[PDB]
Amino acid sequence: TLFQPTSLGAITLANRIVMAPLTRNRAGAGFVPGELTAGYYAQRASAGLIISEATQISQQGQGYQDTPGIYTQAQIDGWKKVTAAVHKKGGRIVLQLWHVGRISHVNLQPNGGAPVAPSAIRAEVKTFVNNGFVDVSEPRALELEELAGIVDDFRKAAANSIEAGFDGVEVHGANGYLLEQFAKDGANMRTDTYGGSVENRARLMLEVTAAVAQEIGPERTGIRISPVSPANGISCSDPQTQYDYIVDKLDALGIAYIHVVEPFDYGSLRRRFSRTYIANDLELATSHLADGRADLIAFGRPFIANPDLVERLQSGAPLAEVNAAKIFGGSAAGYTDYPRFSETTSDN
């Protein structure tokens, strides 16, 4: 059941509830975790496993303002306090490694340069920059030569995550960012070895996960994927073929887990992968687990508004709704001031 302990690769989890990666845009100077962030995560450490907010491996890979990094010592040292705070509550925390690719803005990029991508095709989405929402910039298609360098930024970012006391990492292979831009033909128009087929489109994602897995162990490596894009995501002519291939290859690398943002056949992916499946509601989630479809279930917004989400799912206490206006940016308010259940109600 949802509330009983389990293991993920090496580590041991108090329960099967995962806190999904949620961007909050509250990092400080130098993309170092802001001073309240340790608290934020420790408040939610009753989660079996926390996946951190997406965290850029380089400034090139930054796409939203005030998201944190994992590439300078300042950031590492900021993260140590957070891993410590989580661990002192008996918790687990994995860092989600990020490269946004074309989902960025010149204002965030080194020297005002153009964001990078497999092909020079702008995304039709906005980002949060200069304290407002603006269309993402036109990207530059990456030279074949640069790719090994990006694989190495992930490699190095994984070893920085271990320095910082994380229990492992999660490669961000989803939600329209760099590695998915390569994976999906809606955005990968290349004709070299990193495009033009299932196997080529899939090459960067697999190279990145293979390098991360070698650096730190497959047992501390996970990846997130999202086979079916939303309406305004990346077009993908045949995601089933694409993601059956990718999961076959991921399973071959021996990695601890896949994290799937869920007409598509997930049972195929589930079958192909021989370790943990993290799927991304209490009672359907329970059936989903009972049914053998997943091993862990990741909840997103509910963890924003209910720090005691695990306890409330277990007791039946009603859940607090999110203040949506305070998710991204700002202060303690709508971040660390969400009450636990006893501090929410009036008897009369």
Numbering used by the authors: 5 to 266, 277 to 294, 298 to 365
Report text from the authors:
OYEs 3D structures adopt the highly conserved (αβ)8 TIM-barrel fold with a closed, central β-barrel. A characteristic feature of OYEs is the β-hairpin lid formed by the N-terminal amino acids and a well conserved FMN binding site formed by the C-terminal edges of the β-barrel. XdpB has the activity of morphinone reductase and catalyzes hydrogenation of the codeinone C7-C8 double bond.
The structure is the first published apo (FMN-free) form of OYE. The flavin mononucleotide (FMN) was not observed in the electron density. The XdpB structure revealed that the putative FMN binding site of one XdpB molecule is occupied by the C-terminus of a symmetry-related XdpB molecule (labeled by *) arranging XdpB monomers into infinite linear chains. In XdpB, FMN is replaced by side chain atoms of the symmetry-related Asp364* and Asn365*: the position of the C-terminal residue of the symmetry-related XdpB, Asn365*, is fixed by hydrogen bonds to the active site residues Tyr181, His176, Gln100, and Arg228; the interactions are depicted in the Figure C in S1 File as a Ligplot+ schema. The Asn365* side chain atoms are stabilized by interactions with Gln100 and replace hydrogen-bonding FMN atoms N3, C2 and O2. Asp364* is stabilized in its position by hydrogen bonding with Arg318 and partially fills in the position of the aromatic flavin ring. The rest of the putative FMN binding site, which would be occupied by ribitol and phosphate, is occupied by five water molecules. The observed intermolecular interaction between two XdpB molecules prevents the binding of FMN and we therefore propose that the interaction may represent a mechanism of self-inhibitory regulation of the XdpB activity.
